[PDB]
Amino acid sequence: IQVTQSPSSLSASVGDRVTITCRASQGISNYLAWYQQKPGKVPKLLIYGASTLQSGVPSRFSGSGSGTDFTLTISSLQPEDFATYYCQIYETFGQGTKVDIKRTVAAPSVFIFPPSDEQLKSGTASVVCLLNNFYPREAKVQWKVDNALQSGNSQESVTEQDSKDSTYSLSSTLTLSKADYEKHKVYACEVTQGTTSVTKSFNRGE
Amino acid sequence: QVQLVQSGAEVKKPGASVKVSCKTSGYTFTDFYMHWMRQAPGQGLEWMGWINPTGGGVNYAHKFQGRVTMTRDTSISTAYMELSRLTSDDTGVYYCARSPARELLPLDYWGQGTLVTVSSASTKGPSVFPLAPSSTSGGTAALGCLVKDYFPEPVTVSWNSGALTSGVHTFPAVLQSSGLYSLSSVVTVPSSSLGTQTYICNVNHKPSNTKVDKRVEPK
Numbered sequence: 534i535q536v537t538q539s540p541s542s543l544s545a546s547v548g549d550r551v552t553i554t555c556r557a558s559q560g561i562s563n564y565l566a567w568y569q570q571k572p573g574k575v576p577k578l579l580i581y582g583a584s585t586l587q588s589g590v591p592s593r594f595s596g597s598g599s600g601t602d603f604t605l606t607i608s609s610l611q612p613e614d615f616a617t618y619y620c621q622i623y624e625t626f627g628q629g630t631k632v633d634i635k636r637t638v639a640a641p642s643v644f645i646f647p648p649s650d651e652q653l654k655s656g657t658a659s660v661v662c663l664l665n666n667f668y669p670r671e672a673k674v675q676w677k678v679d680n681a682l683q684s685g686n687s688q689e690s691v692t693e694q695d696s697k698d699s700t701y702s703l704s705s706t707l708t709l710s711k712a713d714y715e716k717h718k719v720y721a722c723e724v725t726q727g728t729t730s731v732t733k734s735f736n737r738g739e
Numbered sequence: 740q741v742q743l744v745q746s747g748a749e750v751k752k753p754g755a756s757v758k759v760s761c762k763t764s765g766y767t768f769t770d771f772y773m774h775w776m777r778q779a780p781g782q783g784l785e786w787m788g789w790i791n792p793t794g795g796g797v798n799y800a801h802k803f804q805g806r807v808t809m810t811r812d813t814s815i816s817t818a819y820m821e822l823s824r825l826t827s828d829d830t831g832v833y834y835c836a837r838s839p840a841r842e843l844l845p846l847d848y849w850g851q852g853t854l855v856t857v858s859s860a861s862t863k864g865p866s867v868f869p870l871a872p873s874s875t876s877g878g879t880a881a882l883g884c885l886v887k888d889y890f891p892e893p894v895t896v897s898w899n900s901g902a903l904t905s906g907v908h909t910f911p912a913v914l915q916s917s918g919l920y921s922l923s924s925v926v927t928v929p930s931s932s933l934g935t936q937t938y939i940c941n942v943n944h945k946p947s948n949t950k951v952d953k954r955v956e957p958k
Contacts, residue, residue, distance in 0.1 A: 566844050568784075575834070575852060576784065581845035621844065624786040624800060642927075644881040646870040652887070661870060663881055663925055665908070688913040690922070704910040704923045706885075 534558060538620055538627030544669070545610055546635040553605040553630045555620035565603045566621040567596060569614075572693050576619065580605070615694070633670075636699040641667035643733040645722050648714060658714035662722035662733070664703040666695070673725040676707045677732075679717045683707060740765040743835055743850035750856045750891050750946065756823040759853045761835035768816035769793050774846065775809060775820045776834040784834075789843060790818060825857040856891040860918040864949035865889035867942050870923065871958045874930035882933075882955045883925035884940035888917070889947070896924035897941045903928075933957040 538555035545551050557565070563583035570576045578587050583603065584596040593608045607614060615634050620627040642665035648658035664672060670691060676683040689705035705722065714737070721734035746760045761773065774789040788799035790809040797809045808821040818835055833853045836846035870883035886894055896909050903926060912922035924940060934957060942951045 564844050566846070568846070575849050576836075576846070577849075578845060578847050581847075587845075587847065619784060621846075624843065626784045626786070629783050642876060642879070642881075644876060644925075646881075646883075649868040649871065649885070652866075652868045652885075655866075659868070659885060659887065659921075661883075661885060661923055663883075663923075665881065665925075665927060688915070690911040690913050692908050692910050702908040702910070702925075704908075704925065706913070706921065706923070708915070 534561065534623055534625055536620065536622050536625050536627040538630055540630060541628065542631040542633060544633040544635045547610050547612060549610045549635075551607045551610060551632065553618055553620075555603055555605075555622075555627045555630075557601045557603070557622050559601070561601070561622055563599075564623055565598075567594075567605050568619045568621065569616050570619065571616040574616075579618075634694060634699040636668050638727060639666060639668045639698075639700055640729060640731065641665055641672070641703075641724055641726070643722065643724055643731050645720070645733040645735055647720070647735055647737065653711055653714070656711045658709045658711055660707045660709070660714075660720055662705045662707075664701075664705075664724055666698060666700040666702060667724075667726065668700050669726075670694075670701045671726070672703060673723075674703065674705045675723045675725070676705075677719070677721040677723065677734075678707075678709075679719050680721075741837065741848045743837065743848055745833075745835060745850040745853045748854040748856070748891075748946075750858075750862060751825050753826055753857055753859055755825055755857075756821055757825060757855050757857075758819060758821040759833055759835075759855070761818040761820070761850055763816045763818070763837070766837075768811075769813060770840075772838045772840070772842065773809075773811065773818040774836045774838055774843065775807075775818075776836055776849075777831045778834070779828065779831040782831075786843075787820070789838070791841075792818065822855075825855075827857055829857045830855065854892065858890070858918050860890045862947050863888065863890050863919065864947040865894060865942060865944050865951060867940065867951045867953040869953060869955040870925065871955055872930075872933055873958060874933070876930075878930050879927050880930040880933055881925055881927050882938055882957075883923055884942065884953055884955065885921070885923050886912075886942050887921045888915075888919040889921070889944055890919050891946055892920055893945075894920075894922065895943045896922075898924075898926055899937075899939055900941060903938070
């Protein structure tokens with residue numbers, strides 16, 4: 534028994550009506566449950582049979598569907614309803630649907646940090662690029678060393694959406710050996726987001 | 740009230756085994772099934788198995804068949820889950836969830852979770868390096884700390900002993916190719932205070948019982 538959950542991620546404003554659909558690969562009668570999970574939190578049961586609301590869940594959460602459709606409708610979205618939702622078919626759970634707060638597009642404030650002198654003495658150089666308060670979360674980050682793309686020696690993470698301005702922040706770390714970091718001069722970090730690219734750079738030793 | 744309390748976090752070498760308890764209260768422990776879940780970092784939930792507390796009968800998923808052992812102790816209303824021959828993709832957060840009768844679909848109540856980290860790395864304290872500011876971004880400057888090469892999760896970062904909270908972004912840690920975690924915490928401050936206001940990041944790594952305070956000075 535297989536599960537396909539769609540959409541992977543949607544963005545909606547407060548008070549909107551959202552629908553999350555997850556489909557089984559065969560007849561499942563009414564053996565489908567819905568769960569809500571916030572980041573760093575514990576999953577919470579919303580609806581268990583196919584439309585039977587769990588006690589304590591607000592009326593805005595509704596379930597429906599027969600066969601393999603099995604939608605999930607929130608009539609009026611609320612600030613506390615922005616989280617990831619899962620559907621369960623017997624022993625199989627869906628990929629999940631992320632509900633995002635809709636907001637205006639915002640260009641990130643880009644900062645670049647050269648590796649600290651303290652870290653250089655241990656033989657490893659880490660240069661960090663900061664993207665501050667941008668929207669949407671989809672942003673491409675690239676590293677250029679002496680005008681040459683690195684492409685395979687960096688990692689990044691994204692903070693959870695801010696509760697005030699509903700924006701995201703990203704931190705990317707380019708990891709190089711001390712020897713390699715001192716064989717080059719120009720270090721640049723580029724942010725590509727919606728027909729706009731911003732490149733913050735610095736020159737080592739300057 | 741219906742409550743499920745699990746044991747603390749565990750760190751295991753590959754090939755070892757981990758046992759997690761689930762102490763329940765507020766309901767008849769023998770009248771409901773007890774399931775075991777796990778969630779890899781950044782992944783979804785998957786079902787490992789359940790145990791009927793009345794007779795101890797179990798039903799494991801085929802993925803964990805022959806590698807997971809689920810027991811219970813009715814006298815203390817506790818359910819146990821053991822996973823042997825651990826590997827890197829056994830790292831995750833494990834839950835115990837309650838289901839009614841001889842069912843598995845409705846999971847009404849869950850435990851708080853137990854973080855199990857499996858790696859050949861050993862518990863190590865972090866190396867905190869400064870993200871020193873200079874400014875070239877108007878009246879706002881950015882500074883922070885780079886918490887580097889620590890194991891296992893988690894670490895907590897505050898600024899000025901919690902006095903500085905506005906504009907603070909503490910990013911999720913990333914797992915490096917060496918098996919050590921590394922994250923960064925940043926804060927945006929007025930550029931006019933770089934040379935006078937003292938900024939100190941307080942990094943606490945409870946697994947190694949190491950607390951590092953680092954002052955970030957402008958260059």
